[PDB]
Ligand binder design. Sequence first.
Ligand code: SF4
Length: 304
Amino acid sequence: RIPQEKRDSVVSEIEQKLTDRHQTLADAIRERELYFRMSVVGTCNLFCHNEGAPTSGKMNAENADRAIAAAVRAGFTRVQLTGGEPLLRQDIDDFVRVARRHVDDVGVTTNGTYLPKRLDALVDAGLARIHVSLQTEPLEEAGENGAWGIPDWLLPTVERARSGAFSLRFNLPVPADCLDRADAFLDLLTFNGVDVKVFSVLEGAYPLERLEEIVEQANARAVAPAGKRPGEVFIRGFRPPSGLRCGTCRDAARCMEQSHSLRLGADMKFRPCLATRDWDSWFTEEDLDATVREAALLALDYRW
Ligand code: SF4
């Protein structure tokens, strides 16, 4: 728990730090490329803090329209639909349509299993991005002889993305003993125009140097047919948090996210940070513009 006067004191410091830079809230959002990450689905009983709960009835198309509109007025130009599995809800394309009314950059982070059922409706709604969180086991099963392959239920999304319908990216976990399988697997993804974000998984330090080399090699090997651009592989470099709050934040050692964003969970809880809950705020039925702005001000506080 954080006293409101301490939260007010911190928010005032962020606003003062912005004026010291001759900067507005929207300019700081643009400089940090901060986006709005709205979780439209909650997963139940999902290991180190608590168990999850289903989606709140307030997480609906109407409130999503208010939250995105308030976020755009605060300075956000991109919305990403997330959660446990956003494609689990049948009205997922409704949220893409709502977000498309306020910004052009609407994306979805999904596990991909529901893409065959939802693909056409998402493109009709004008979805711009699809990020698929891959798992090692389906890649092994989709391949043969131990090599990794693309699961069947992802191929139509891959081809539709290569045709310019939307941007597609795969999040590829690479365990320590799978550097050679991931190396060859990156060729399949880049050839089909799929961007890849690789990251490490799991005594015995991780071979992080060779994985970085594999990324550089896979980008240099990248070829693509029909004069198209091949997919781009990249791995995020670590950088410690350095905001005003991070110096005395009990979770600073576990704050490793490099793509920062203002979050709105399926429980109507705004989250300026991922590693700590101290700065969360509630979704309000009144004065939503000021509530979104205050949470967005705290969302900047990680790098100055
Ligand atoms: S960013 Fe939020 S979470 Fe990461 S350290 Fe600063 S305060 Fe703690």
